[model samples]
Each structure stands twice: as C-alpha cells, then as structure tokens.
Target: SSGRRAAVEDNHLLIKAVQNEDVDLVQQLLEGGANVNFQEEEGGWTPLHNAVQMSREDIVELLLRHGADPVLRKKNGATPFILAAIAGSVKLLKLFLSKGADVNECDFYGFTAFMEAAVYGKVKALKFLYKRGANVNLRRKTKEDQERLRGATALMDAAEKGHVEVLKILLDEMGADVNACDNMGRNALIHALLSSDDSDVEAITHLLLDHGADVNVRGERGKTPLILAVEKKHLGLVQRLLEQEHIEINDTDSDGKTALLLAVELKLKKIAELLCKRGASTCGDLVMTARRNYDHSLVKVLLSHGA
Candidate 1:
C-alpha cells in the first residue's frame, strides 16, 4: 500500500487505480491533477473505459464526475456506453443513457449496441435496448466492414453466435426477417450452420425453419444448407434439413458439387443413403465419385437406388 504516488507524469496512476477498483486512490489521482481521459497506448482505453470494462460502478462514477468524456472512443470506436452494453449491465446502461449516451450508437464495425447485445447473448441488454427503440434491422455499413459480415443484421449475428434467446426476441417479437441474406448471400438459416455444436446448430436451424427461414437458401459459392451440413459432417443437421419438404437435395455448389456427390466424395455413406432415399440421383458423378473413392458400399447403395 506504500506505492501510492509514482514519478511518472502521465495519468497511468489514475487508469491503474480505476482498473484495480481503488476508488479512494482514484479520487486522490484526480485531485493530484491526473488526466481523467488518459488512454492506454495499446487499446486506446481511457480510465473510464477500463472502469466500465471491469464493471467498477464506483470508479466509473468517479471518472465521469471528474469530467471523463463518455463519448471518447477506443481504437475500435467503442464508447464507454458500448462497452456497457457488451457487459449486459442494465444499471450501467441506464446510467449511460442518463448521461446522454445514444441508445443506437454503433462501433467501428457498424455493429450497434443492439447487434453487440445479440451476438454476445445479452438477452436482458437486448430487450432493454429494443424497448428503447433500438433499430432491430441495421446492417453493417461501408467498405471497411468485415467482408462476410457486410449487410448482416442483428438476427444473423445472433444466429451465427448461437444466441437462441436473442434470436427468439429478434424473430418472435421484433419480426426480423428470417430470410434476410447477408452480403455473402447467406440467410439466417445458413448462418445458423456456422454455430459451434450440433445442439446449437440444431436448435437454431429448427427455430429458423419454424419462423419461415428459407430452407433452400444458398450462400457464397452457391453452397446450399444441405451441402454445408454434408461438408461439416453434421449428420443430425443433414437429417433435419432433409426433413424440410422444400429442401433442394440435388442443389449443387458453385463448384458443381451436389450434396450427394460431396457425400460420395467424402465417403459419407449414410448421408448418401439419406439423400438417395430422399430422391437424389445416384447416377453420373455421384456413382463415379463413389467408385473413385473405392467406396463399394456407397456404390452398392447408389446402385440399389437406380444408379
């Protein structure tokens, strides 16, 4: 505790105090003429940003009363309020709103507070922001946007991250378009396939489909949901997609690879069997692919299905 004051001129002391949750030391730092807005060289995080990130309400209040600029952004254009939204702190969010923070302000990636809450699985924050009239449909903006994420809405973000509750609010209450495609030509259903696990992917896919997500939506390189499931070896997901009556089982990718052909090439005998039972043609490249892989069992299945 004897390391109270340092010879360093910058307000790293104030930042350190805030980060350490030392409210008294922070008060002393401010009184000692430390710059309340001193940003770290690495992340451009000010004392207030650090405080909010650490969820130190007392320190954040202290910094704010000391004239910390609430709107000063970090390296990625994230305001203190945006960090609060990311933290899912209704208390801090309310405080920022009271302090004149814009409810719909976006970060550098064009991800607004709503999108941040959705993608991060902050259901409470998302509901609060939505009730506050946050735009439920704002997509990313500009050429500086992440390539695959351009034109992606909060719904897509939630689906991609497997935030089912967030998606439920977006789809059920907000009426977000289940078929809205990103710039990558992928709908929410396609994005759901990007989830981390079978359960998540399964839950999200079923949710999307129940909400009218296009089962036949194609994505980058003309890859359909069936092809994606096949390539990823998501057997359950593949079975679920095939269960959809409108699913285009014979649809090919931009590389001319259908789900059956891909399954045969990957030696996925079960998936090939599923597709064939669902009326996938067992002729030409499909049988050819099976033969090339020396997958006699797959070729036999294809032959039984009229190869």
Candidate 2:
C-alpha cells in the first residue's frame, strides 16, 4: 500500500509535467518510476496522447524511450500514432513508426492515418506514408462503419473533399482505383460531384473521367453519373459525361425516369437539350412531359431529335 501510494503520486506529477510541457520534469518523473502509459480516468488519455496533442516531439521521444505504449487509445479511440499523422508532422510519425506503430492502423471510425491525411488535406503526410508502403487502397471496413463509407478508400476520401492534389498523387502515383465503389456504389467521380461546391470539382471530375472513371457507373437508387449530375444541377458535368461515347443516355433510375425525363421534370432546360443532343431517347414520356407541361423549347428540341 505504501509503494502504491508513491506510484500514484509520481504518475500524477508525470501527467502534470507532460500537460505543462515541462520536458525535463516529465523525463525525471519517468526515471522516478511513473507509469509511462498511465491513462487518466476522465479522458483516457495517456502521456503519449498529451504529447501528440500538444506537438511535443521532445516529450514524445522521451515517452517512447521510456517504453510508453504507442497504440494506447483515448476515450475517442484515437491512438497517439494516428494523432501523429493528423498532426501532419513527419518527424512525429517517423518516431512512432520506428517504435513499431503500424502504418495502417485505423481509428475508431475505420479511418486510417492515410485516410485522415487525405480527408484532412495533408499532402505531405500522404506522400510520406505512401512512400513508407501504406496501403493506398485500404478500404474502410464495413463492420460498424457508416453505410455510405463502407468500402471507401483514401482516393474516395480525397475526392469527397476536393483535394485535387491528393487525388492526383493517389491516382497518378499510387494507382488508386478511380472506379472503386462505396456501399452505395458511388465511385470517386460520383463523390467528387455529389456534394462539392468547390470550383475544383470541375477539374476533379475531369481528372477522374480522364483516368477512366466509368461515366455509366450506376450508384444509389440506380442513379448513373449523368443522372446524378442532372439531379445535382451540374450542367457542365452532364455535358462532359455525354462526351463519353459509351455513356448510356437512356439509363433509368429507380423512379423509372431517364436523365432526360428527370431533367425535363426538374425543368433543367439546358441539360435536357444537352441530353437530347447526345441522342437521349424520348420514349420514356419525355416528349409527353415537355408537351404536356407546355415547355415549348423542350418540345421543339425533342421533336427536332425525332421524338
């Protein structure tokens, strides 16, 4: 009981020194037999977690030297090594890796350090990790993951965030799959176009397509890239998709509406014209909808296309 009391007091001092960034005090406490891996009850944060959080490379090196556990997770399930990646410090990352931190270990949300770097736009960290043989195509394991993120990769993560530089590295350098689908069958191109208002979306979409992204790759609710582009009011994206010669213009969604049908229904006049120009079939009540809705311009465009 006396030894236990001494140990607890030393650990309390060690945690205080680490939090206060007193490197010498932390080192001295560790030498005095403080637990290097003592996680406080409230935050579940070890000394390594505090060091990584505060970007204390000095303290981190000291902790690792004292045999602090590299993979001890905090309450949120973030390991110090994973936080090192998110911190975007190659020096910190190397320290953990040299001590046997798995380069591919994921966090609680199935996000690896590489995926975090990609999503967080850490281009340099991404490059370093990739060169260290991190799996560029490491997928988010489906078990307990959000439904939309299952089977997703760093490439999809980059695309979703409009990190075009990261995307280029993953695609041009690491050979990440541009057509790799998530649980909903959405690929990098689909993710790029789905939620981004970044001006880079145009360039990102072009990059994916030029890298052979399948324009006809159907996703949630049977929505093809073209249909999704239309639903999202992406005029230029729809036009670019039509340029792909093998694109299925008449592909219908779960609602049984073709791209042109949906475009007319949504009154996206320019997209409807683009689809009609690319030989979208008017058979699925497209002309009837236009004629019935009294949209003269659409009626003329469809009739001109032999509807």
Candidate 3:
C-alpha cells in the first residue's frame, strides 16, 4: 500500500486491459486512479497506442477523456497516430486527429505518419491526413526541433515504394512538391530510379519526369538520374531518360564519370550504343573508355558517333 508502488500496479493493470481490448477493465483502472498514459516497459506502448492498434475506439476515447496524452510515443518514438497510420486504420486515425494529435510528428527513423502511409501506399489514410492540411513537404521533427531535420518529403516516400497511384494523389490532389529533396538532396526521381527492384519503377520514373522533376538533379554523391539508371543496368530506364528533351547526357558524377562512360566501363553494349546515338559528348576520354574495357563493339559505336 505504498503510494507510488500502488500507482505503478494500477498502471500495469491498465496497460494489460487495453491490450486485451477490455474497455470495462480499462475504465475500472482509470477510476482506480490509474494513469491513462502509462506505457508498458517492454514495448513502450501507452494504453492509447495499444487501444488504437487494436482499433478499439471505445477504449481509445475512454483513455483520452482520462487525460491519456495523444503525443506520448513508444520507445521507438512512434506516436499513436504514426502507428494508426502505419496500420492503415483510418477510423482510429480520425479519432486520434480529432483528439488533437500532431499531424507532422515523425518516428525515430525520420518517418512521419503521413510519410509512412505514403510509403505503404495507404491512399485512404493519406487522403484523410492530407485533406486536413498535413504538410505535403513534411520532414522529420527531432526531439527538440533544434537538430537539423532529415528533409524527407511524403512524395519521396511514395516514389521510393513505387506507389504510382499514391504519387499521383500527392501530385494531383495534394500538390506535393515534385522536386522535393531529402537530407541527401535526393528527389522523387532519384528515389524512383534507386528502387530498381520495383517492377513499377519505370512507371514511377515516367510519372516523376512528366511532373517536372529535375532531369539533372544531383544526389548525395553527385550522381544524376541518368547516371543512376545506367549504373543500375536499367536499359529501358536509361532510354526513357535519354528520350526526355531536357535530359543532360553529358552530366558527370563526383568521380567525373558520365552515363556514357559508366555504360562503356560496365560493358553495357546496348546502352552505350543508345548513349552515343543520343550524342553523349563525343569526347576522347569516353571513346578511350570503351578501348580500356576491351569491347571493340562499344568502340565501334563510340567512333561512329564522333566520340
């Protein structure tokens, strides 16, 4: 019957009750002077986080009314709203928003609820958050809002996951920034090109290009979109980039390697042919690149294009 120990015991009971979705037991604990915002030590989930995870709106409102802090995050720095968005729980998310949850709060890894929903391609949740004025170009806010944010936008998240429909929504419906860059200066096009594993990456790339993404945008390492496509061995992507009228074929990376040179070095015979045909600067060093690679075929193509 020590005072603080008794409070701790009630808090444990409250967390367990919420996890089990027992609204009656949760109400009992709250009435027993339990702290509604008490987070479990193991996973750092407040009663509200657990209730929302279970989609128990009944207990969710109960906890809120009892002063459960909506912004209380788990040890991972994910608030209840972020979890609800990740789970694609529109109903629970709406409840949290109505209870005054911060829309732009991000988890530890620099991902916000709106951003994570976009990454997961949750259109409904995304629409819900966006309609309420969630910042289209939101970045992760650290603990003190003093440290420099990661500068990741919701558009980048959607593009990286190859969510073409979500991208359209961000662009068309919400007017998200097409050329928004992250902490590394990576735009949506760069992310789409980097996600070589996505079968829809080509479509995503096309979307980004059509929407005014910088054709020659440089990334963290000074790699251009065209250069990245070539390094990934994506012949079709490279060709699509070259087809863009604004494409800068002669753009080089930090190491001074152009798409054409990288193509010749990688022995991408067909791609090198396309680059030379697209007039990737007819320079001696690029022509010599094919010579060093021991590919007479590339050298033949390079010379034909005045390289």
Against the true structure, what is each candidate's TM-score? 0.91, 0.80, 0.82
RMSD to truth, every model: 3.7, 4.5, 3.6
**What is the per-residue lDDT of model 3 for residues 132-204, given as tens digits with 9 covering 90 to 100?**
7787787655555536332678898788888889999998889888987776888889988887456898888
| Per-candidate total of colliding backbone pairs | 0, 0, 0
Give lDDT tens digits, candidate 2, residues 31-104.
88889999888979888898997778988878988998887888767778788777887888887788778888
Q: How accurate locally is residue 167 in candidate 2, as Cα lDDT from 0 to 100?
A: 86
The candidate, 2 or 3, that scores higher on TM-score is: 3
Off by over 4 Å in 1: 1-10, 142-150
Query: For model 2, how many clashes?
Result: 0
Give Cα distance to truth, residue 304, candidate 2, Å: 2.4
